[PDB]
Design an enzyme around this catalytic site. Structure first.
Site, PDB file in Angstrom:
ATOM      1  N   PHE A   1      17.540  47.505  -2.421  1.00 26.66           N
ATOM      2  CA  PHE A   1      16.982  48.118  -1.227  1.00 26.66           C
ATOM      3  C   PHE A   1      15.460  48.172  -1.232  1.00 26.66           C
ATOM      4  O   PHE A   1      14.865  48.449  -0.184  1.00 26.66           O
ATOM      5  CB  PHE A   1      17.553  49.534  -1.043  1.00 26.66           C
ATOM      6  CG  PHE A   1      17.161  50.502  -2.128  1.00 26.66           C
ATOM      7  CD1 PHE A   1      15.981  51.228  -2.033  1.00 26.66           C
ATOM      8  CD2 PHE A   1      17.977  50.703  -3.230  1.00 26.66           C
ATOM      9  CE1 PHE A   1      15.614  52.121  -3.023  1.00 26.66           C
ATOM     10  CE2 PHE A   1      17.614  51.604  -4.220  1.00 26.66           C
ATOM     11  CZ  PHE A   1      16.429  52.310  -4.115  1.00 26.66           C
ATOM     12  N   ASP A   2      14.817  47.924  -2.375  1.00 20.11           N
ATOM     13  CA  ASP A   2      13.362  47.960  -2.470  1.00 20.11           C
ATOM     14  C   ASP A   2      12.932  47.208  -3.721  1.00 20.11           C
ATOM     15  O   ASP A   2      13.643  47.203  -4.731  1.00 20.11           O
ATOM     16  CB  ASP A   2      12.847  49.404  -2.505  1.00 20.11           C
ATOM     17  CG  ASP A   2      11.359  49.501  -2.243  1.00 20.11           C
ATOM     18  OD1 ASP A   2      10.779  48.551  -1.678  1.00 20.11           O
ATOM     19  OD2 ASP A   2      10.766  50.528  -2.611  1.00 20.11           O
TER      20      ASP A   2
ATOM     21  N   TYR B   1      17.494  60.774  -4.032  1.00 22.69           N
ATOM     22  CA  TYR B   1      17.476  61.193  -2.640  1.00 22.69           C
ATOM     23  C   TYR B   1      18.572  62.198  -2.266  1.00 22.69           C
ATOM     24  O   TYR B   1      18.718  62.516  -1.080  1.00 22.69           O
ATOM     25  CB  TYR B   1      17.534  59.960  -1.747  1.00 22.69           C
ATOM     26  CG  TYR B   1      16.322  59.097  -1.971  1.00 22.69           C
ATOM     27  CD1 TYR B   1      15.156  59.317  -1.255  1.00 22.69           C
ATOM     28  CD2 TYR B   1      16.324  58.092  -2.932  1.00 22.69           C
ATOM     29  CE1 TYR B   1      14.037  58.542  -1.462  1.00 22.69           C
ATOM     30  CE2 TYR B   1      15.202  57.310  -3.147  1.00 22.69           C
ATOM     31  CZ  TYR B   1      14.058  57.546  -2.409  1.00 22.69           C
ATOM     32  OH  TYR B   1      12.932  56.776  -2.606  1.00 22.69           O
TER      33      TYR B   1
ATOM     34  N   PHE C   1      17.083  51.397 -11.224  1.00 23.74           N
ATOM     35  CA  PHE C   1      15.762  50.795 -11.095  1.00 23.74           C
ATOM     36  C   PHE C   1      15.456  49.935 -12.312  1.00 23.74           C
ATOM     37  O   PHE C   1      15.628  50.383 -13.452  1.00 23.74           O
ATOM     38  CB  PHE C   1      14.673  51.863 -10.936  1.00 23.74           C
ATOM     39  CG  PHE C   1      14.674  52.554  -9.594  1.00 23.74           C
ATOM     40  CD1 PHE C   1      15.464  53.668  -9.375  1.00 23.74           C
ATOM     41  CD2 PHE C   1      13.868  52.102  -8.564  1.00 23.74           C
ATOM     42  CE1 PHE C   1      15.460  54.311  -8.147  1.00 23.74           C
ATOM     43  CE2 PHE C   1      13.858  52.744  -7.335  1.00 23.74           C
ATOM     44  CZ  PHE C   1      14.654  53.850  -7.128  1.00 23.74           C
TER      45      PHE C   1
END
Length: 108
Positions: A37-38, A83, A100
């Site tokens: 997503f990033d 989140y 990550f």
């Protein structure tokens, strides 16, 4: 759970980020199913943040602090360190565990 740090490649094993230092990283963020997503690598520009200023999620603050300069590591972050229940609509779903890939390039 909080954040789990699993090494990918070793750093200098001696220099760890301290509060107020700027961490220069390349990173990729994926959902627990593997969907990215990033990623700073897809932008070809390292990402900088100041440790302790809460510019990043809590899993980053406490996970990157455990990395030595030059290390690449896998951070697995539970939603409370992430989140949370709310997530980020259209990007991060509710109660999402995030993974990550982070490389600490240098400290500034």
């Amino acid at each position: 759970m909080g954040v789990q740090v699993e090494t990918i490649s070793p750093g200098d094993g001696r220099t760890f980020p301290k509060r107020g230092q700027t961490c220069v990283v390349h990173y990729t963020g994926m959902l627990e199913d593997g969907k990215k997503f990033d990623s700073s690598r897809d932008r070809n520009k390292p990402f900088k943040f100041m440790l302790g200023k809460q510019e990043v999620i809590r899993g980053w603050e406490e996970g990157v602090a455990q990395m030595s300069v030059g290390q690449r590591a896998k951070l697995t972050i539970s939603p409370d360190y992430a989140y949370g229940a709310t997530g980020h609509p259209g990007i991060i779903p509710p109660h999402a565990t995030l993974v990550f890939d982070v490389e600490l390039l240098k400290l500034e």
